[PDB]
Each structure stands twice: as structure tokens, then as C-alpha cells.
Design a protein around this ligand. Structure first.
Ligand SMILES: Cc1cc(C(=O)NC[C@@H]2CCCO2)ns1
Length: 152
């Protein structure tokens, strides 16, 4: 059948929102009131992959954009990028592995682990207005826990 998707927003555990800045540039900042319109709305697709009660493979596309978060080696490191796709072909149930995150529910928060790069997570910095990145530990000063808000 089709792939199933939900619209949503994400905020890090310090309650920073994710907003688009430069071309293909996703950053996190503290946001409230009128400025909340600037936050990125995701289309979270439920995709093919290894699954358990608390570990659900997803893709994260930008709502009504042919852009997906992906995990690739860049200058020899697991990095987070926004990648363009053919809008006729996406989303799909069998997303390529670089697009797949394991959405993990622990203690009423979510972590998004790269399916391609085990133990690398969507991360934010404590500082305002810094890139969203792929970080190689769910431990230390960088933030790897999020909450989801469901959108119409
Ligand atoms: C100036 C700025 C640059 C970035 C930036 O490079 N963000 C990278 C993330 C990875 C996925 C897409 O965005 N944010 S503010």
C-alpha cells in the first residue's frame, strides 16, 4: 500500500524549536509566540526497517518539499544533510538507508538514531542558532532527546 506519514514538529529537550536559515540549513533556537510559524514542519514517514516496541524506523521529510534528512560520510565523518529527491518517487515505503532513522522512545522523550550509522543521533547544541547535526554519542553536553508535536 502507500507509505504512511504524519505531519509534526520536533523540539529538543531544552525546548528549542528547529527553523530553516540558509539553503539546506536546519538550526535550533528558543522560539515562542508569532515567530513559531518559522519552525519546520516534518512529514515523518513510517518506513521499512528493523523494528521493536520502542524503536520505529522513520524518514524525516520537510512538509511538501522534496527534501529529506539523510546521513552520509562527509570529509570522512557521519554527517547530517538535507538531500533533494525526485518528487514523483517520494516518499516511499522502502527508503534508502541514509534516509532512515530509528525513532527510539526512552523516558517520555524521543531519540533519532541513524539506521546507517549505529549510535549516531540527530543532535543540537546548547547554544542558540547552531546547526542541527549528527552526533556520535547520546551522552555529554550535546542534546539528543526530543519531543514531537503532531500538526494538522
Ligand atoms: C549558518 C547555519 C548553518 C546551519 C547548518 O549547516 N545546519 C546543518 C543541518 C544538517 C541538516 C540540515 O541542516 N545551520 S545555521
Amino acid at each position: 500500500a502507500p507509505v504512511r506519514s504524519l505531519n509534526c514538529t520536533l523540539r529538543d529537550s531544552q525546548q528549542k524549536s528547529l527553523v530553516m536559515s540558509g539553503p539546506y540549513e536546519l538550526k535550533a533556537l528558543h522560539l515562542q509566540g508569532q515567530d513559531m510559524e518559522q519552525q519546520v514542519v516534518f512529514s515523518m514517514s513510517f518506513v521499512q526497517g528493523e523494528e521493536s516496541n520502542d524503536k520505529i524506523p522513520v524518514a524525516l521529510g520537510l512538509k511538501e518539499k522534496n527534501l529529506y534528512l539523510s546521513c552520509v560520510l562527509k570529509d570522512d565523518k557521519p554527517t547530517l544533510q538535507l538531500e533533494s529527491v525526485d518528487p514523483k518517487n517520494y516518499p516511499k515505503k522502502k527508503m534508502e538507508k541514509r534516509f532512515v532513522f530509528n525513532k527510539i522512545e526512552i523516558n517520555n522523550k524521543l531519540e533519532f538514531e541513524s539506521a546507517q550509522f549505529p549510535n549516531w543521533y540527530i543532535s543540537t547544541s546548547q547554544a542558540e542558532n547552531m546547526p542541527v547535526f549528527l552526533g556520535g554519542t547520546k551522552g555529554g553536553q550535546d542534546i539528543t532527546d526530543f519531543t514531537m508535536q503532531f500538526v494538522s
